Amino acid sequence: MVPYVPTPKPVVDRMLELADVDETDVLYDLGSGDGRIVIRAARTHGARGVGIEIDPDLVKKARKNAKEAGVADLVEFRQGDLFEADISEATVVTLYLLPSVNQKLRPILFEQLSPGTPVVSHDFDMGRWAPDRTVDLEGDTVYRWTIPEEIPEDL
Numbered sequence: 112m113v114p115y116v117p118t119p120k121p122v123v124d125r126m127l128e129l130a131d132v133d134e135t136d137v138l139y140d141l142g143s144g145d146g147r148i149v150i151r152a153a154r155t156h157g158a159r160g161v162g163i164e165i166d167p168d169l170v171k172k173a174r175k176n177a178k179e180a181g182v183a184d185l186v187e188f189r190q191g192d193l194f195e196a197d198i199s200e201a202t203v204v205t206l207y208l209l210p211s212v213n214q215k216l217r218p219i220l221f222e223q224l225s226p227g228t229p230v231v232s233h234d235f236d237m238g239r240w241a242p243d244r245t246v247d248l249e250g251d252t253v254y255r256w257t258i259p260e261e262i263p264e265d266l
């Protein structure tokens with residue numbers, strides 16, 4: 112079970128840089144919490160955003176946060192389980208979940224996401240799926256992968 116403890120805002124900024132997020136992107140944050148990843152993607156980079164979040168109290172907070180930030184026209188939140196969500200329109204995916212949850216999610220990412228889609232994770236890796244980047248911050252790690260044209264036979 113993934114607790115609500117958010118990614119610090121400076122770490123969020125580094126995640127968005129690492130994925131080269133820009134105004135043409137549609138960023139999906141899977142387990143979106145207070146909405147900070149999608150809100151900062153919209154405010155800083157002009158990207159459209161979708162946050163998927165299971166807890167209705169956090170969906171409510173995130174919607175309020177987006178309105179207060181002046182980015183409600185760019186950002187949408189959906190109440191639901193991320194393992195059941197349609198994420199195929201994502202051009203970038205961001206994650207701060209758990210090691211076991213990342214492992215369960217991996218095949219869904221391969222099923223739904225277009226080749227070339229960046230995936231960025233705070234702190235937790237994807238097992239034998241090797242990252243393209245690993246950024247060491249003071250007390251946090253950020254990984255990036257790019258969805259390949261062919262899934263490695265190992266995976």
Ligand SMILES: Nc1ncnc2c1ncn2[C@@H]1O[C@H](CSCC[C@H](N)C(=O)O)[C@@H](O)[C@H]1O
Nearest residue numbers: 113116117118142143144164165192193207
């Ligand atoms: N199966 C699931 N589907 C959607 N959201 C889930 C989920 N399991 C846990 N969550 C949510 O995932 C969030 C993890 S905290 C991370 C929040 C945000 N992405 C950030 O980085 O700041 C919590 O808000 C929790 O309620």
Ligand SMILES: [Cl-]
Nearest residue numbers: 174186187188
């Ligand atoms: Cl919304």
Ligand SMILES: [Cl-]
Nearest residue numbers: 129243244255
């Ligand atoms: Cl790079």
Ligand SMILES: [Mg+2]
Nearest residue numbers: 130131132133
């Ligand atoms: Mg890009």
